[PDB]
């Protein structure tokens, strides 16, 4: 609610006039509580019995329009009943009508400002809610309200017409309704004017995302009712990663330490998954502790995991022209079950005439040893080893790996076993 003219303020703020001189009369009184009150009266009806007709106007000072598009007016007034006056069959009324006119400049100093020939626009005729003049303080004081269609010039005048009533204007209040600036739906909306055209019409208002918000792909919008309230919205922003709603649809606050928020929007932060920390606020993800990782496939809400330890309990057995390597699971799997194994083969030479200080050649196997499923990428703790030579001594190493350890190797954890093919000379004691 934004005031453009109030009679109960700074004593009246009055420069008004009356078209037929003496048509309206300013009479000042004391109101129910203590206060000087400028009021205007028109009761010519008690004059000549023909009346000779009544057309007595009362015009305001130029009202600046400030930004209002739709002016509301609130009148307080007494009206004397026609039954309670001299014999005034016909000529007496109990109503007055109400007008406005627009101007972009106050009325033309002294050289046009006898108005009344200017095009006045009618607003409505007003009547009292019944059951000279003068407010007695018996709450004969009627209150009525009306409003004027769109205001576009710099200001306006308002005029009052008495055509046979015994009237006492007591108070006038000219205002417009405004919608307050507000935080709604994670956005800010400005103070917004304007019914404009009248009661049903709305005025559309654009919002900006508050601290740490984004649109909801939708860029926000909110609508200003003709009485200053905010009718229903479209769109709205959402909070940002690392930020959660706070004070309710109204702001976004950073996650506290040890919490995070991966993603989109109006959703509270959640505490860090296993083996991660959020050392600081506004965390979008909790990084893993030293020695732990998250795989390609791991979302930020996954716990962090680690690479495996070495395979255990290597052993083997011969089956025809080939040899089967066996082992068991690592004692530490890092909290993931995408464990798979890799086997390396080495043919080792060694202790003969030269190189008596660790003299094993230990090259890798030839291209004629094909391991039965794969040699690399095994999910099972076994492999069949193909074409390895008769007395040549081999060494078979088994590496463990899982879905991290792309992420840091240190070299993969491993185990190996000395292996020699054939056996002879039965036991004699
Ligand atoms: C596989 O066999 C080799 C050779 O027989 C083993 O080698 C030696 O290990 C001892 C201590 O255990 C060292 O003192 C020697 O110097 C090593 N030899 C050489 C040539 O360096 C080896 O330990 C065995 N490893 C497995 C896993 O079976």
Numbering used by the authors: 1 to 131, 154 to 239, 249 to 460
Article passage:
Eph receptors are the largest group amongst the receptor tyrosine kinases and are divided into two subgroups, A and B, based on ligand binding specificities and sequence conservation.
First, inside the LBD, EphB6 has an insert of 11 consecutive Serine residues within the J-K loop (residues 151–161 in our construct). Indeed, this highly flexible serine insert might interfere with ligand binding by hindering the formation of a well-defined ligand-binding cavity on the receptor surface. Second, the H-I loop, N-terminal to the J-K loop (residues 125–130 in our structure) represents another unique to EphB6 Serine-rich motif, which is fully structured. Finally, the first FN domain of EphB6 has a seven-residue insertion in the loop between E-396 and G-406 and hence, adopts a significantly different conformation than the one observed in EphA2 or EphA4. We suggest, though, that because EphB6 is kinase inactive and obligated to use other Ephs as co-receptors to effect signaling, this loop might be part of an Eph-Eph oligomerization interface, to mediate interactions between EphB6 and other receptors (e.g. EphA2) within the same Eph/ephrin signaling assemblies.
